[PDB]
């Protein structure tokens, strides 16, 4: 139904900055949301950021407020995660998801394969 492709991950220095990209098939759902989630080894997956199709509505996990920014290029159907002031504990697989609500992972029915981010001190 909707396929999602993440890019932009890898090794980065602590204190540094990355921008992740998520390309999606078709067009953004008009009322449901697209989100970034992450899952570190041994831990449950957790929401990072989400937004609506207009782009006006955005929501962030407390852990990343003020450091990460979600946005869209409507010129495509690509959503971005700008990640600044990275910390070692931000190390995780980062996933793009579509068709869900806010940071409620169980409401999303489309998930990317995920992209590794490792933050090196």
Distance CA 58, CA 50 (A): 6
Rg (CA), the chain: 13
DSSP structure class, residue 104: B
Task: Report strand pairing: 46-51 vs 58-60.
Answer: antiparallel
Q: Where are the domains of the chain?
A: 1-121
Q: Taking a C-beta distance cutoff of 8 angstroms, is the pair 4, 112 a contact? A: yes
The structural architecture, per CATH, of the domain 1-121 is Sandwich (2.60)
Residue 67 has a CB neighbour count (10 Å cut-off) of: 15
Query: How do beta strands 10-13 and 115-120 pair?
Result: parallel
- What is the experimental resolution, given in Å to one decimal place? 1.5
H or E element at residue 16:
none
Q: Which method, experimentally, gave rise to this model? A: X-ray
């Amino acid at each position: 139904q909707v396929q999602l492709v993440e890019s932009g991950g890898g090794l980065v220095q602590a204190g540094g900055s990355l921008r992740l990209s998520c390309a999606a098939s078709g067009y953004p759902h008009p009322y449901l949301h697209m989100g970034w989630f992450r899952q570190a080894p041994g831990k449950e997956r957790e929401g990072v950021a989400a937004m609506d199709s207009g782009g006006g509505g955005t929501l962030y996990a407390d852990s990343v407020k003020g450091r990460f920014t979600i946005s869209r290029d409507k010129g495509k159907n690509t959503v971005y995660l700008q990640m600044d002031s990275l910390k070692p504990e931000d190390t995780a697989t980062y996933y793009c998801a579509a068709g869900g609500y806010q940071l409620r992972d169980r409401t999303y029915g489309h998930w990317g394969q995920g992209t590794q981010v490792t933050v090196s001190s």
